[PDB]
Every structure is written in structure tokens, then in C-alpha cells.
Write a protein that binds this DNA or RNA. Sequence first.
RNA 1: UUGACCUCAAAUCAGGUAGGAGUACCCGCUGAACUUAAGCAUAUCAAUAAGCGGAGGAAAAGAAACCAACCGGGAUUGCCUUAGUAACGGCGAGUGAAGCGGCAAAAGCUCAAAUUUGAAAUCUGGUACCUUCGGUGCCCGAGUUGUAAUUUGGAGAGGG
RNA 2: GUUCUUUGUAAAGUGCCUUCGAAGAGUCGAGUUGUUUGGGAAUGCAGCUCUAAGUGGGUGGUAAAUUCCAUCUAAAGCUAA
RNA 3: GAUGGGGAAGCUCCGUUUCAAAGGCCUGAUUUUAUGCAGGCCACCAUCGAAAGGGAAUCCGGUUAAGAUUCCGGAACCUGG
Lengths: 48, 187, 68, 94, 173
Amino acid sequence: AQKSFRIKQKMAKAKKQNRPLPQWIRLRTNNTIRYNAKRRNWRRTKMN
Amino acid sequence: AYKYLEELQRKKQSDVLRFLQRVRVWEYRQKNVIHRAARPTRPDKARRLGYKAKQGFVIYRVRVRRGNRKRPVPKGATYGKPTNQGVNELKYQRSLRATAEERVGRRAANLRVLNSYWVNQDSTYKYFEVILVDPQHKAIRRDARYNWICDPVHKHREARGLTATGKKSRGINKGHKFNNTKAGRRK
Amino acid sequence: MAGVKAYELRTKSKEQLASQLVDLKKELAELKVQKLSRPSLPKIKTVRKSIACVLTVINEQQREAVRQ
Amino acid sequence: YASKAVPHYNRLDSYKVIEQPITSETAMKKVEDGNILVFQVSMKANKYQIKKAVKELYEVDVLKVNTLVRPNGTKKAYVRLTADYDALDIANRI
Amino acid sequence: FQYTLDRNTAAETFKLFNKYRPETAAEKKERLTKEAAAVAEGKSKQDASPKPYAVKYGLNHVVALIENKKAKLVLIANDVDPIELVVFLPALCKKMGVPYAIVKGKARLGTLVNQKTSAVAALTEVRAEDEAALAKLVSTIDANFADKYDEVKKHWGGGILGNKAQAKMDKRA
RNA sequence: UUGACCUCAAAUCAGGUAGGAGUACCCGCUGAACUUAAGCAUAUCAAUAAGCGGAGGAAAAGAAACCAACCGGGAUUGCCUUAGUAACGGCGAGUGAAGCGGCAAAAGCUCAAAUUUGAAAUCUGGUACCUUCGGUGCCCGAGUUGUAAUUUGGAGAGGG
RNA sequence: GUUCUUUGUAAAGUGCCUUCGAAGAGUCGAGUUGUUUGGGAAUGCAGCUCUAAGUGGGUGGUAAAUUCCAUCUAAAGCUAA
RNA sequence: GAUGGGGAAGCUCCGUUUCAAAGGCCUGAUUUUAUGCAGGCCACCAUCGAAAGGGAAUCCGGUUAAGAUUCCGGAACCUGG
């Protein structure tokens, strides 16, 4: 699958936000809510 | 002069009116759907309706198509009673020349249209001719004895109904009618 | 600028506010070439917002210009 | 032709325009065993621009520039160096 | 290849009823010439006229002024589009008294009015003149175009809607 | 050989213009059936939903080609009434609005048709209270020019 | 506040005379087709034909006729709540 | 599948083969670098539509945690100037 940027960039983002909850935010003096909660699993939900 | 012309074109058919309507239609007919302005064909009772004068000048011509109503579909169908069932012969509430006024508008509303005059009739159309004034323009609002057309809403309305033939084909009556509605009414 | 603003507001040439800007820039860049652990940044942020102060103060004193 | 109004101001610029010294584990190596500086870029990389960039900014000279569109958004360049620039040597910057 | 449009116009403009209607043909048959290369005596007099004989200039004006009788040798023009306007004139010319004159170049009768077009032009002054003009001219011209309007319908023809001028010069009521 | 008149164009050549959007509610066009009739066509549903094209702060309407008996009344708009009544109707099922009355808000007006063929209009330039493409001037230059002013419910008189 | 007052040939209000100026056409009305209305031989709308008048037309909630009478000026406009 | 246009109340429908100015370009050209002209081809009836069709030009060796007919070594051929 030799892609195209349109689907490239996007592919790349799948990556960029494929990451576990930040952990700082966990203690922002306010609330913060735990868990990435938006979590693509390249085996569960799927891209485009 | 204006008067002679007015009461002159008041006698149709008639030698001149005819031997003229003929050349002309034989001309006109052949010249693109609408074929914007030239220099005002019949200026006579054109003044009666704020003639040429607008804005500096601009009065375009359009051939609408004659006849009754093209009921689309192929079918019915839809039950039929209260047809419904009927198709070939519905009749257009529109106003034949009205359509003309609208299209003219579309073909360019750089202006706004003051009113539209007849001119001739084949068996395959009805040769109507509309007027303008380019509000988004000059003296139109400058030497505005007429900025009426210019102000906000009174514009493009060359088919919101508030025109003349629509105004007529609706309710400019007063008494003996249910013709200002809307309404509906009455609940 | 890095201020002020009340400073950059006057008044060296486009070819003066120039190497001021170019300066702060070679700053920001090297400031990046740091990139090593922490990182704070902190004055990467400083140098940055400033970079703009310059940029904006730079695109007006050429505008009121065109405005003549 | 003709006119009487126009655009506005020469905004900008548009250039700059070499990102953030993309150098890690393997990159350093590039700038080592091979002598080929692994900077990065701005995806809208004007291409031979990169040339004019480094050749200007770090100013030494370069020979090839093969430039992958890394999996990130990272559009990272692969620059070399004529008999001049000795990598770590022109790693005065980084 | 769209000059045709107008070309072919003139074509049927002749072809169909090769005359047709009123002096609507007078402004045709008797037009093609009207009013000779003898008219240029008029269109030379009425040339430097703005010095020896004032001038006219006034379309509707010349209409009410052939109703107000103070007119001159009034010459109506060949050209006309519509021909509607100047087709009035051909009637209230004798129906009042003036000496009609279906003169040549429309735009010429706009030369003799320091303006672009224009409509039919006339007069009402001289004294030098008064003879020279009205004499040879109004004699000859009034003869031609007038005794022409006599029949003139045919030749062609019709001098149509008199019932028109009837209406018009009636009307006032 | 040399000017224009005229319909027709072509200009990145100058300068504006629209086109999309959009809860409600306004101007239109275009148009169902479900439904009730204990059936079903008539019809009701309904000038309703859907579809389309146009506005606004509202919109639309409005100085009557009205209502009216005598009596008379006097642009629209809205409300209360008029009235579930005049009518309309397989006169079945159901439709069903008006107009001297009391309210609410209050405004009235300009063209075409008439002459002395315009001294009225666009611009663009110079300068101008207005500080660069700009509120309006003046003078001037090209261009417009059946589109400068009284007169339009009532007549003001229109002319003398 | 108006240090102005370019004008005052700038405009308004009697009885006297001039079928006094004369006022919107493919329109008005009609035949017919559809449509719509509470509209009923009684709505408007729009098609296709036909097509006026000028002591003219429109209307007057049954079609004709003929007298009369009553009442407004249509087929070009703007306009606050 | 836009446009020359034509249908449709209208979203839009229909037409690329039967309808100004053409479409531009070209060498020479009125030329000291604009731009007519000498002459030619002239609705070219826009453009989209192939990672198997059409189709300029590379290969061997070496290399990595993970690439490669590219990186790098050597040796090449094409295209435009």
C-alpha cells in the first residue's frame, strides 16, 4: 500500500495520538478525568 | 409625442402594428433566450411604467415559453381524484411573463427590475421585455428621485412576488376576495 | 520586542529592526539546538513570543506607512 | 493592463526555514561514519531550498539531499558535505 | 457571421409585403431618395443655420410645435427604430399645415442640432433668407413630400391609421 | 483617401456588483398521501408535510377602479366581535369568511400623460472644511443625454 | 451658541375667464380549460383563443334585457408604527 | 464532464459532431527590448478518467536492530541548458 499524503498525514496522526493518557494532567489542580478515553487500537476500531 | 405613440400602439394588428409586429418577431425571435437591452423597443407606455430612465439606462429582453403546465414524473401516482391522477393539462398559476421577469433577473441582478412590458406573441412563446435601474450604482441613488428601488429589502424581489404581475396575480384588490394571505388563517 | 513593545515601537530601520529580528531568530534557532533535557524551555517560549512582538511591531510601521 | 489599488504589504517572507536539528541515536551516526547532517524541515520543504538554507545558515556546502517524509509530520532531510564540512566538525552547532 | 441577423432583417424587411402599410412605406419607397440631393440645399442652409437661421432640436417638442403651428419646413428622417416614433409626424404634417420633409440622414439631422443623433428637425426664423429658404426649398420640398402624402398610399402603401391622428389630435377632452 | 450614425464585440486594462449561509417568524412557486367518512372514489386530511426561490428586522398590506341601504362611512395592519352563524357540502361526513361596533397604532404622499430640448446626471482630474484608494463641494475636461424643474387626489389650478 | 444671512424674481393662500391640462392595451371584459373559494349560474389565479371604450370604465354577494340609481378610478409607484 | 448555447417554477435537465467576435501559436515582423503587418495551420469543439494498457533514461557489490534498482563504492545511460 504505497499511500498518498492525504492518507499519509492521517496515517501519521493515528500514530501521534495513539498514546496512553498523559499523566501530568492527572493532577491539574481542578479535576482532569482519567484515561485516554479516545483510544484507537489498530485491531479494534479502525481507520478511514 | 409620447401620447401619439401610446395611443398608437393601442391599435394592434391593423396595417402598421401588424406589418411591424411581423418583421420584428421574425427578427427578435432569432437572438438568444434572453438577449439583454438595446435602447428600449416601445418607449410609449414604457414611461407609464417609470420608463427607460434607470439607471442612466438598462432594459433587457427575454423570450419565455408559451403554453400550459409540464406536470413532471411520467406517472400519477399518487392516487387520483382530486387528481392528482391528472397530468397533461394542469395550468400554471405562475403568470407566463412573470417567469420572464425572474429569469431576466437571474441572467443578471447586478441591477433590480422596475417592471416588464409585453411586445408580441408566437405560438411558441410570448415576447416580454423587462426594465432595471442598477441600485448598486450611480445617480440611481445619487439623483435618487427613486432610491425606493435602492433601499435595503425592496430589491431582487423581482420575484419575491412583490413585483407587479405577481402583485396582480395575488391580491392588489381590496374587498370581495381572500387575497392578502398568508392568513391560512385563522387558527 | 522582548519588552516592550513600548521599546521596539521605536524606531530603527526595516534594515535595523532587521538584525534585531534576524538576531532574536538565530537566537530561537540555537536556543533549539539546545534541545537537551528538561527543558523549561523556558526562554524558548520567551524568545518566541518576543520573536513575534518584533514581527508585529514590524508589520505596522510599514502599514501606517501605506496609509500615506 | 492597468490598476489603481493593490494587495497590501509584502507579507512576508514565507522562508526561514530549516526545522530542529533532527539528531538522535542513528542521526548522530550519519553525522559520524558518513558525514551527512540530519537536520529536519518544514514539510512544505521548498526542496533545493533546503540546499540554499543549510548552504546559507550553517553555511559550508552540500552535495546530495535525499529527504524522507518521516512517519511523524517530521519531513527530515539527509544532507552531505564536500571535502569541507567534517560533520562533527560542522557539529559546532549540533 | 452575425451581421447576418441585421442583414437578413433588411432582407425580409423588403421581401414581405414589398411596401406594406402606411407611409410606413413612404418611409421606404418614396423614402429611398427623400429628399433628393436637392435637400442638401436645406441641409446646407440649416447647416450654418446656427448663425443665419437659429435651429430646432426637440423630438416631442417638434411634435407639439406642429400642433402649435409655429413650425418651419420640418424634415423627418429616413432611419427609425422603432420607426414607430417618426411615423406620427407623417400625418400631423398636413393635418396642421407645416411642410413635411422626409429628409435623409437621421444622424445628419443630429449634425444640424449639435448633438449625437437625432430626431426630426425644423425651424421658425430667417429674414435673409425667409425667401431663399421657404421659397425654393419649402416650395419644392412641400411639393414633393406633401402632394406625395396625397396618394403615396398606394404608392405601396397606406398612410395607415388616420383613425390614429383622428384619435390623437382629437383626444384633448 | 478621410469622419461619424448604428446595431455587435473584445479588453487583467476603470470601478462596483451576486453567488454561500442561515432556529424561529415573513413573499412566492410547487404539491402528497396517512387520515374521517365506520365501506370508497365525492370530499375530509389540506391550500397541510416533503421539494424548490426570495427577503428582513420584521415582513407583507396601505391612500381605494373600497365598504355601502337612506344613513352614510373613509389606506393598511392587529385584537374583541361578527360566527361556528351567510353561505360551501354523496347539503353527507365535515367545510365556513365578510361588512357602521368597541378597541391598538396613526401619515400621508410621487409618477406617466403638458412646455422654453434639456443645463439635470456619471464619472476624472486640479484644488477644497473635511489628511492616501475616501463624507460633499467648486472649476474645468471626456463622456451621457426620448431620464433638468411645476403638474399626480385634490387637483395645485395648467395658461391667460 | 448661529460672529451667517447671496438671493428674496424664493414659495404660499380669493372671483374671472379657457369640452380648462385628460389620467396606465394584448389591457378591461368575454368564451373555454384547469385550479381555488364559504364563492353559491356568485373566488381569485393562470393558460389557450377574441379583444373595447372614452358622458369611458370597475362594482353593487343570481344569469338576460331596458330603464334608472348608488358608489369609486384599475391595467405605473413609495410609505412609519 | 464546464463553456458558444438550448429545456425546466426550480434545485437543475440537455448537449461536446449541424450557430460573431473564432484559438492561439508560429517564423519572418511596423521593432533599439512593445505590438500591426507577410503568410500558414485553424469549430483542434476545456479538462478528468490506467500504481496490470500506452510509457525517456541503472546496474553489480557492500551495508542495518529495522531500508534500499536510492544510502555508498564503483561503473552508467536519459532529459533539459
